């Protein structure tokens, strides 16, 4: 507001300010709401656009602009902006909804068998884990376990994970009625409680080595 | 431009974007062109406003808004944003034009007797020194030598430096017609070539221990 008067007062600042706004619109992720402007940002801000890939993906998913996730996938040189071991559960889960982005991450830094760990009992927009308290229960999982269970994650994401060496037999600890057991990607194959998509993913898993 | 349409498309982003613009206007230093808006930035962005003190001073001096330098001086908690040993000659010289800012820096981290070093032969807006080439000649100086010689630096800046322990007898190497000598804060006292202000600063220096 008062910027417009101060800017109109000294036009010499107009050039710098235009660059500054674009860097802030990139850094905030918001340019992902209009894919044409995202396209420009990568071509002529390889430093800034790349550094801000995490916020751009978050805005890209929230805006439901799948084309924006495609643009990010195309221009990603490595997975360093997506530190798998520090990301919050919601962002990792959302990344698994885009098989092409997942594939790019898997070929440039993601370990598909990394044991992920978040707090067991959630409470009700942070992208990175914060150690606010360490004396709370944690629950382990994997990219493949998340993919098998979540009905918003496509079958192709299971395919990509297996393709890049996700281990179909890597389990994690869970409890059921007080009894601890190992949870695997293939769990309870005979159930009226598996959705259609869950059943199709189990068949994919059983059929992979065929 | 195209931001205005995308912003008017989703008003939920308006709040975040307002915060983002202000952070970018702070980070760029530009808000120092209107002291009222600088005042707001320190009160409610102690993290951002403080982190961006170097760019804010630069804009404050360039805008000739001395009130903006006063506001920065008041809110500066320490001199860490002004690393004396990394700053370029022009920015250090400009800081010496504001005795109150200098005093705040001297009480929160500046060593007044630090030997400064920049390239001897300048060539024709970088605030930090960049080691682009190390095989070029460097020339040493001090805050007090700079203050004595520069007719844009007030006498009060010499007073502040002496007050905080600047050593009036700390010299540096120079050449005159091939012969190396030590340059001191008090150099050639008898000369029709000393300006009025230079003479007054020499008297200040001679008179300090009186």
UniProtKB/TrEMBL annotation, chains A, B:
Q: Which domain of life is it from?
A: Bacteria
Write the protein's name: Ankyrin repeat protein
């Amino acid at each position: 507001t008062e910027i417009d008067d101060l800017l109109r007062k000294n036009p010499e600042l107009q050039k710098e300010w235009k660059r500054t706004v674009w860097t802030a619109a990139i850094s905030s992720g918001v340019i992902a709401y209009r894919p044409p402007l995202l396209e420009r940002a990568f071509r002529e801000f390889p430093m800034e656009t790349a550094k801000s890939a995490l916020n751009l993906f978050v805005a890209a998913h929230k805006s439901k602009n799948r084309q924006s996730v495609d643009i990010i996938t195309q221009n990603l040189k490595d997975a360093k902006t997506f530190p798998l071991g520090q990301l919050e559960e919601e962002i990792v889960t959302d990344i698994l909804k885009y098989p092409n982005l997942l594939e790019k991450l898997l070929q440039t830094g993601w370990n598909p068998n990394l044991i992920l760990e978040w707090e067991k009992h959630k409470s009700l927009e942070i992208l990175i884990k914060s150690n606010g308290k360490e004396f709370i229960e944690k629950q382990e999982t994997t990219l493949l376990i998340l993919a098998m269970q979540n009905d918003f994650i496509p079958m192709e994401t299971v395919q990509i994970l297996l393709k890049y060496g996700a281990d179909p037999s890597l389990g994690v600890k869970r409890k059921s009625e007080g009894k601890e057991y190992l949870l695997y990607p293939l769990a309870n194959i005979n159930s009226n409680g598996n959705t259609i998509l869950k059943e199709l993913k189990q068949k994919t898993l059983i059929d992979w080595k065929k």
